[PDB]
UniProtKB/Swiss-Prot annotation, chain A:
Function, in words: Part of the AP-3 complex, an adaptor-related complex which is not clathrin-associated. The complex is associated with the Golgi region as well as more peripheral structures. It facilitates the budding of vesicles from the Golgi membrane and may be directly involved in trafficking to the vacuole. Required for the transport via the ALP pathway, which directs the transport of the cargo proteins PHO8 and VAM3 to the vacuole.
Designated gene of the protein: APM3
Transmembrane segments: none
Top-level division of the source organism's lineage: Eukaryota
Family listed: Belongs to the adaptor complexes medium subunit family.
Protein's name in the database: AP-3 complex subunit mu
Keywords assigned: Cytoplasmic vesicle, Golgi apparatus, Membrane, Protein transport, Transport
Compartments where found: Golgi apparatus; Cytoplasmic vesicle membrane
Organism: Saccharomyces cerevisiae (strain ATCC 204508 / S288c)
Length: 391, 576, 621, 168
């Protein structure tokens, strides 16, 4: 029986194809142009070359290799997912994107056979990628939605396999669901609601992913994100035909506790789709910051402001300046539909939900400073999609 | 020095061809073109034509120089003029061209045919740049053209050709003289050319064509390359010379082609085949002479031939031959296909595997042909309708490999027409159909076939005893189907039941009544289409059936009418 | 077809990468030569021999590869022995060994029923040992076997394996009891229960993932036990890996139905009881009957769990969940509220396809079954740009759920605003039709705006063939609910057809049917429409002619009974009227006569067939 | 348009090459040496056998029917008694025109050269060239006639001689 596994992209493009010895060459697929609907298909021919497509690629890849026989559909979905996860680890697990796939397409093939077989310092680096859909109405930016995705990783340096406790805090936002990684344990009782126990892998391990929806949170917690979570952008018209002034402040007042943002990347899209990028010539004259880098991609119709992790504790990188829509043509009608300013923050050592960790330590009947030390620089990552401030 | 001038020129050309300092070469190239010797003038001219660009003294000298050379008759004047003219052709300035033409004129007045040839050719390249030159030079051409020498004629001709491309008006003035020259030629090549030219002049000026054609054909008839056998053909076919007045010409041309087409080499064939087909569109009589050639081309291996043949075959047919040919094509394509679709064997005798060989889309055309054959006229005469039926089912199989859906569509429509007529053959068709349907291969790709099969069975379910299993087939397969098919199936089944009821007299049999119930359950399943249209279309029939059931209860014979009673009712309720 | 598809891959396959396995051995890394040994025979010997050695450690290495050969179907290869040896060796007290061995057992069963039986015996002896680490794995293979004779064993075992407090074993003892419970009802069920219980209550992912894959089976038949067991499962999922979660879905789908507390005394007194939830009887206490899957925290927990899984960021878990969330649902499951918020949340989060659809769908299905839960999300689903054709399509179905009469104006304003405004894809327009169909079902006073909106689109645009076919199907639905607005809807469509003697073939089809269907409501008028059609049918497309028939036909009917006695025609007795003596045969006939004659002149058989009948029956009453 | 004319001795020696349009200047010489080999493999009757070639066929055996195309360049070969003539044409000039022009060029060369020597052709590269051009010009071969073509060459020689250091 031959089993072939292929990772396709979004628009069914096949990226990897796995062979298993010898010789080998609609409702959902109709849809997959959309990113996640590929599962069952029958490529079918009369020969028992039946292949069931359960359809999951994690990290923008589509994997869908059909088996040579029987196996069952959902049964193949499990073998598929497993295949997905081993490859990232092989790559390092950092990012099996279609690009990498191609490059590593070979290591992926070798795995498929291998999985197919498969019969001291601690640091908790909470990386937190927020994404928040803000709607500007009334002078203040009201977080309408948003998703902060925290991954909590931990990079360790022990020698054996002690256990870790991590105390997480609520930054009074009921923190609700921490999701824990396969090398992680969340016994309901033994570990308090705000604490979890981690067993080694050697490997970086995502310790807890957390998703939190900011709308109710922020409202429940009362938080106008002053430190973070609300970057108030005021785009003042009273404009002239070319200028405008928007004041965006990203105060690190509530982020003082937080280390900084390994990399806050602000991509302001100024719709240029409906206005012709030449119409949008825009210039960002004044950008207020103390520790980052603002370069404009005007041509492309885009802001990118990259704040480097370097700002420490509570320094307030003021975000302000002016957008001037400079036009090489006169054909810009001083319209820039101002559309969705997505700000993706990534905070490394902050909690996506507020899963703030006061401290973490090995926990085996041990006492604190029974000989275990605390590290610095796990690193998680977190991504969702993405903040959006609508104006 | 004259000797170094010649040498420099050789090497200078190499440097000048690079995009290098031409100043160093120019002086020499110039003094070289100013040296009376005819050889230096020759090489110099070749080089300067590459170098002259920009430096004014260079070019200037080159010009004023070529003049003095042309002016004096020169007496090895043939070469001097000859080259100097070519050369000047490649230099262009208006000052130069201006001189050049006045020079070419004097040169045309050389006796020697050698000179008369070059001067002609040169005036070609020149004119391509500077028309004033041509103007002053035309008058002479007319005087040269009337020279007794066959080569000079051949040249005057070529030149007049190019100039026709650019100026035709002047040269339509000289065309008469061109004819008179060709009339005196014994040479095979001279004939070939004069032909190409006249073709060019013909596109512009039929008068010439008419005068020249008959001079060609007497010329081809006397030459045997074969080279003019192709040329006269391309010319004949082009000027569109042909027009019929010119058939006679074309005839000889074709006859020469047919002889050649009749050698197994694709180099000559293709060229002929194309020329044939084209001629045929133009000359039916020729076609009838070339039937044999065509039939043979069918087994030819050349992708352009095969395709060109099929297009010819299409026009040429004998019925017994048709039936045979069909079967023959069926095997060919299972073995002629591949070669340059992909690889690349060497083509010998040796590969025992043979290279083998079809394009990729020739497969689709093959099938289409089959169907056509069955329908042209009324292969009312496939005598054996059986075979057709088979073939059709067969083709459907291979095409499943290709798809192109249309292959599969045409096949179906044809099948229906076959079954309809030919009540015999029904059993074969039904048996196959039934199996084909439940054999998945039709479901793959083939909604059309299914649509037709559906209709066929309603018509012939009368042959089959168990019209119950058939209908339970069809009913089990309905959920596996595309929307077009689904719409069809539904529509068909309904068309059927109407038949049985007409024939059921066996008893009416109760069974038919039960079967209707089943069809109902099914159609309900199709009322679950995502598109409202189709959905509503099906639900309409479901209700229809439930009716027929009530009808059979009341009557046996009266059933068809009964169905037309209730069915429309339902239909309206829904629509209402 | 398949050619190009294959080539594209093959081409890269070969050279991909440095000939596989020949470069596999040649350039293997340190252990780059194994590729040629076990690649070119590890060899059974390297196995068996290592199995007949008595040491649990040696049976390990041998058990490792040993699994390969079995996988090769080298059929020649007693597999019974390896199977047997490995079975006896399973009774060894080493965990690693037990693992491999289990891996094996699972293989054999994949192919052969007898052996599948032995492998089960062994797992019994070892299961009767006090060692929880082994009793576990061992019971695991017993489950990946597929089979039914493996029950008289796996049992006596699973018995002692639950009676062990260990989580490892507790995980495994679930796999067994299960994959064995499917085929052994007679000797097995007594114990196979008092077991699975205490068990399920373990923590280890490979224990839970196992009891799951388990409980999913045994219970096909003896589901009473399964229950008290299924709970922890739903709870456990909330604590676990994404794999262990998807599995719990497939099961949660299979087991309740398989169970459903087959009525035997069914205690409907369990909780708030609908179908009584048992807890197991042989268990204590307060009888929990059977129907329990419908009733019992196990079935329910299934829904809650499904949510978490959705909140948990894994799409697969998210879909499979949504699928079961709607499938079970007694709707009381769906009024979770969670599915809603989480759904809408995922929606925007989800960039995974199987999901959006499921998501947007949920929104609708959920609004329908629960509006009040979406109202905070209305202005939210004003379409998101990124989204697909089905997505924007579902957005419409949502608005259709949120309407009130007082609020309706607020909504409708958005709808129409979408058709015209959105950049709506063709398919969207098609759906927008299927929705608004359900919207007016709610309001009458507002319906006019809805329908008018639809018609205006059709009357005016020559819309696309697909759309036209769609609209025609929809308009067919609304007319069914709002017969007062209905009359206009029909008249308007008629005029459009009357002008357009060119219309589209599929359009004429829909347009006509609708007129058959609507005739019930006021089938006094419909002749006016059919009149123009006939007059101009003779110039039309076939399919169009077919529908035109059935629909002329229907229109005629509804009113035969109502026409007939009414139509027994020009009999004037019918222009007399009880209720439906719609000016009947005359008005309807005058239309049909034309229709029939016109249909006959079309091609399809069904069109003509119906047309012929319609006339015959219509005529004769 | 002929973009280039190649003259080779029976023993494959190149000797002339005309190139109407820009083409690689150095590779031209090499390319001419390659397409020589093939000529030797083809049979005398298949003499020249214009060698069309995919490029990768310049010494390439990926394809069994190895031939040299000089990339996108059709090579027409003609064999005469002892000289071969290769013409590289662009895909836009008629094949026949090219063939004829070749065949004609040949008969002419024979008559033009009483006893062609590889050497006599070399020195008289320009001469040989002229003949080629003349034949071509205004697109026109204007004398085609083998009797004239013969003189034509002689004429050119006479001229060139009279000029010869500018020539030799």
């Amino acid at each position: 029986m031959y089993l072939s596994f292929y990772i396709t992209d979004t628009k069914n493009k096949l990226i990897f194809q796995y062979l298993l010895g010898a010789t080998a060459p609609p409702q959902l697929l109709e849809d997959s142009s959309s990113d996640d609907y590929l599962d069952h298909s029958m490529v079918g021919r009369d020969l028992e070359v039946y292949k069931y497509f359960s359809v999951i690629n994690k990290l923008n890849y589509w994997c869908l290799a059909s088996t040579s026989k029987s196996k069952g559909p959902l049964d193949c979905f499990t073998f598929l997912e497993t295949i997905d996860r081993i490859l990232l680890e092989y790559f390092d697990k950092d990012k099996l994107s279609i690009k990498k796939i191609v490059n590593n397409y070979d290591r992926i093939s070798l795995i498929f056979n291998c999985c197919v077989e498969a019969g001291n310092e601690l640091y908790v680096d909470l990386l937190e990628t927020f994404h928040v859909v803000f709607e500007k109405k009334k002078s203040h930016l009201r977080l309408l939605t948003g998703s902060i995705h925290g991954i909590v990783d931990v990079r360790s340096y022990l020698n054996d396999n002690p256990l870790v406790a991590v105390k997480l805090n609520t930054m009074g936002n009921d923190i609700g669901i921490p999701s824990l990684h396969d090398c992680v344990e969340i016994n309901d009782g033994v570990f308090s609601p705000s604490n979890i126990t981690f067993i080694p892998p050697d490997g970086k391990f995502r310790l807890l992913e957390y998703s939190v929806d900011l709308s109710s949170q922020v409202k429940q917690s009362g938080v106008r994100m002053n430190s973070i979570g609300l970057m108030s952008l005021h785009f003042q018209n009273g404009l002239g035909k070319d200028s405008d002034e928007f004041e965006l402040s990203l105060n690190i007042e509530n982020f003082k506790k937080v280390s900084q943002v390994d990399d806050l990347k602000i991509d302001l899209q100024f719709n240029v789709e409906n206005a012709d990028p030449n119409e949008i010539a825009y210039k960002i004259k004044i950008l207020r910051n103390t520790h980052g880098r603002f370069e404009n991609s005007i041509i492309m119709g885009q802001g990118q402001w990259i704040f480097d992790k370097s700002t420490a504790t509570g320094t307030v990188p003021v975000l302000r300046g002016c957008i001037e829509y400079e036009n090489t043509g006169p054909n810009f009608t001083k319209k820039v539909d101002l559309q969705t300013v997505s700000l993706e923050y990534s905070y490394i050592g902050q909690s996506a939900s507020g899963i703030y960790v006061e401290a973490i330590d090995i926990v085996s009947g041990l006492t604190i400073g029974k000989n275990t030390k605390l590290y610095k620089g796990a690193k998680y990552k977190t991504q969702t999609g993405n903040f959006q401030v609508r104006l | 020095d004259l000797n170094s001038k010649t040498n420099a020129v050789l090497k200078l050309t190499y440097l000048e061809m690079y995009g290098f300092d031409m100043a160093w070469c120019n002086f020499h190239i110039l003094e070289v073109m100013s040296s009376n010797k005819l050889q230096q003038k020759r090489v110099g001219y070749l080089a300067a034509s590459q170098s002259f660009y920009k430096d004014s003294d260079i070019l200037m000298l080159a010009t004023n120089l070529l003049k003095k050379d042309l002016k004096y008759d020169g007496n090895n004047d043939v070469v001097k003029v000859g080259i100097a003219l070519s050369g000047l052709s490649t230099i262009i300035t208006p000052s130069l061209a201006r001189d050049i033409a006045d020079d070419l004129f004097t040169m045309l007045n050389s006796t020697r045919p050698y000179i008369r040839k070059k001067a002609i050719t040169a005036l070609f390249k020149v004119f391509l740049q500077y028309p004033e030159a041509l103007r002053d030079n035309f008058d002479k051409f007319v005087s040269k053209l009337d020279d007794d020498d066959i080569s000079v004629v051949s040249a005057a001709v070529s030149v007049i050709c190019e100039l026709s491309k650019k100026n035709p008006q002047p040269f339509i003035q000289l065309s008469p003289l061109l004819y008179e020259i060709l009339v005196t030629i014994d040479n095979n090549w001279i004939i070939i050319r004069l032909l190409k030219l006249f073709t060019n002049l013909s596109q512009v000026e039929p008068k010439l064509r008419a005068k020249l054609l008959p001079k060609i054909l007497e010329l081809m008839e006397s030459t045997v390359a074969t080279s003019v056998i192709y040329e006269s053909v391309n010319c004949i076919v082009k000027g569109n010379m042909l027009e019929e007045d010119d058939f006679e010409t074309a005839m000889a041309c074709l006859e020469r082609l047919h002889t050649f087409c009749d050698s197994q080499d694709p180099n000559l064939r293709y060229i002929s085949c194309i020329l044939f087909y084209k001629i045929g569109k133009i000359n039916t009589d020729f076609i009838s002479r070339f039937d044999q050639l065509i039939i043979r081309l069918l087994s030819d291996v050349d992708v352009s031939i095969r395709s060109k043949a099929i297009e010819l075959v299409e026009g040429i047919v004998d019925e017994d031959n048709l039936k045979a040919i069909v079967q023959t094509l069926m095997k060919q394509f299972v073995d002629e296909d591949v070669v340059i679709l992909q690889t690349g064997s060497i083509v010998y005798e040796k590969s025992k595997r043979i290279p083998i060989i079809i394009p990729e889309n020739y497969k689709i055309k093959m099938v289409n042909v089959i169907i056509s054959i069955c329908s042209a006229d009324n292969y009312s005469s496939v005598n054996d309708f059986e075979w057709y039926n088979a073939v059709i089912m067969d083709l459907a199989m291979l095409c499943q490999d290709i798809s192109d859906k249309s292959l599969g569509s045409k096949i179906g429509e044809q099948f229906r027409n076959l079954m309809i007529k030919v009540p015999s053959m029904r059993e074969v068709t039904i048996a196959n159909i039934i199996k084909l349907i439940s054999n998945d291969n039709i479901n793959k790709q083939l909604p059309t076939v299914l649509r037709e099969c559906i209709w066929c069975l309603g018509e012939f379910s009368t042959l089959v005893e168990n019209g119950n299993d058939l209908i339970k087939i069809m009913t089990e397969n309905i959920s596996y189907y595309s929307h077009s098919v689904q719409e069809v199936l539904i529509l068909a089944l309904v068309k059927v039941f109407s038949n049985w009821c007409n024939n059921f007299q066996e008893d009416k049999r109760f069974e038919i009544k039960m079967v209707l119930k089943e069809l109902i359950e099914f159609f309900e399943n199709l009322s679950y289409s995502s598109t409202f249209e189709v959905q509503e279309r099906s639900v309409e029939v479901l209700e229809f059936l439930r009716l027929s059931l009530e009808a059979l209860e009341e009557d046996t014979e009266g059933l068809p009418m009964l169905l037309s009673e209730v069915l429309p009712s339902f239909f309206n309720a829904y629509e209402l | 077809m398949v050619d190009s598809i294959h080539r594209i891959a093959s081409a890269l396959d070969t050279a991909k990468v440095i000939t596989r396995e020949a470069a596999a051995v040649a350039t293997s890394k340190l252990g780059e030569s194994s590729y040629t040994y076990y690649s070119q025979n590890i060899n059974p010997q390297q196995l068996v021999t290592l199995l007949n050695s008595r040491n649990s450690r040696e049976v390990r290495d041998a058990m490792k590869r040993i699994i390969s050969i079995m996988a090769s179907d080298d059929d020649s290869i007693d597999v019974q022995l390896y199977f047997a040896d490995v079975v006896k060796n399973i009774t060894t007290n080493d965990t690693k060994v037990k693992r491999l061995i289990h891996l094996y057992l699972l293989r054999f069963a994949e192919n052969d029923p007898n052996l599948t039986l032995l492998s089960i015996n062994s797992l019994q002896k070892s299961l009767s040992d006090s060692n929880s680490e082994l009793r576990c794995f061992a019971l695991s293979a017993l489950s990946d076997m597929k089979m039914s004779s493996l029950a008289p064993i796996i049992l006596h075992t699973v018995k002692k394996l639950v009676t062990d407090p260990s989580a490892m074993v507790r995980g495994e003892v679930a796999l067994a009891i299960i994959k064995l419970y499917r085929a052994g009802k007679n000797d097995y069920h007594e114990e196979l229960l008092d077991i699975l219980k205490e068990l399920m209550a373990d923590t280890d992912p490979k224990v839970i993932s196992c009891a799951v894959l388990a409980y999913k089976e045994c219970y096909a038949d003896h589901l009473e036990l399964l229950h008290g067991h299924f709970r922890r499962y739903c709870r456990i999922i909330k604590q676990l890996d994404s794999w262990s979660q998807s599995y719990l879905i497939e099961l949660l789908i299979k087991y309740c139905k398989q169970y459903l507390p087959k009525p035997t005394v069914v205690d409907k007194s369990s909780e708030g009881s609908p179908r009584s939830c048992p807890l197991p009887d042989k268990y204590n206490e307060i009888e929990y009957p059977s129907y329990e899957v419908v009733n019992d925290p196990d079935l329910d927990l299934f829904l809650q769990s499904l949510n978490c899984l959705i909140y948990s960021s894994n799409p697969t878990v998210i879909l499979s969940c949504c699928n079961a969330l709607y499938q079970l649902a007694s709707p009381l499951q769906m009024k979770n509220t969670k599915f809603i918020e989480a759904l809408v949340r995922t929606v925007t989060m989800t960039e995974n396809q199987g999901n959006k659809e499921m998501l947007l769908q949920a929104i609708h299905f959920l609004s329908i079954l629960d509006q009040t839960l979406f109202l905070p999300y209305t202005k939210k689903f004003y379409v998101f740009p990124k989204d697909p054709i089905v997505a924007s399509i579902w957005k419409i179905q949502i608005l259709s759920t949120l309407i009130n009469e007082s609020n309706v104006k607020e909504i409708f304003k958005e709808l129409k605003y979408y058709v015209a405004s959105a950049h709506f894809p063709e398919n969207v327009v098609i759906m927008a039709v299927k929705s608004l169909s359900r919207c007016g079902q709610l309001s009458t006073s507002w319906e006019s705006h809805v329908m008018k909106w639809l018609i205006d689109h059709m009357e005016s645009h020559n819309l696309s063939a697909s759309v036209l076919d769609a609209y025609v199907n929809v308009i067919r639905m609304l007319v069914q609910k709002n017969p007062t607005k209905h009359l206009r809807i029909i008249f308007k469509l008629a005029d459009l057809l009357t002008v357009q003697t060119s219309l589209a073939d599929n359009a004429r089809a829909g347009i006509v049917w609708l007129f058959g269907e609507i005739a019930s409501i006021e089938f006094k008028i419909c002749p006016d429409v059919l009149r123009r059609l006939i007059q101009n049918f003779s110039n039309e497309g076939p399919e169009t002619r077919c529908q035109i028939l059935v629909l002329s036909a229907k229109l005629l009917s509804y009113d035969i009974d109502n026409f007939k006695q009414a139509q027994v025609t020009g009999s004037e007795e019918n222009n007399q009227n009880p209720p439906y003596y719609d000016f009947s045969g005359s008005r309807i006939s005058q239309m049909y006569n034309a229709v029939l004659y016109l249909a006959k002149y079309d091609d399809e058989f069904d069109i003509r067939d119906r047309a012929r009948m319609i006339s015959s029956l219509f005529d004769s009453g | 348009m002929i973009h280039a004319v190649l003259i080779f001795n029976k023993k494959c020696q190149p000797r002339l090459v005309k190139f109407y349009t820009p083409v690689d200047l150095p590779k031209q010489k090499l390319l001419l040496e390659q397409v020589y080999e093939l000529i030797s493999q083809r049979n005398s009757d298949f003499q020249s056998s214009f060698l069309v070639t995919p490029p990768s066929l310049l010494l390439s055996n990926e394809n069994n029917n190895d031939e040299v195309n000089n990339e996108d360049i059709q090579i027409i070969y003609k064999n005469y008694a002892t000289l071969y003539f290769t013409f590289i044409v662009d895909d836009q000039e008629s094949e026949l025109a090219i063939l004829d022009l070749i065949q004609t060029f040949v008969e002419s060369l024979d008559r033009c050269f009483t006893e062609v020597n590889e050497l006599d052709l070399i020195f008289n590269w320009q001469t040989l060239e002229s003949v080629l051009e003349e034949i071509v010009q205004g697109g026109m071969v204007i004398e085609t006639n083998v009797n004239r073509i013969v003189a034509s060459v002689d004429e050119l020689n006479k001229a060139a001689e009279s000029t010869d250091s500018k020539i030799g």
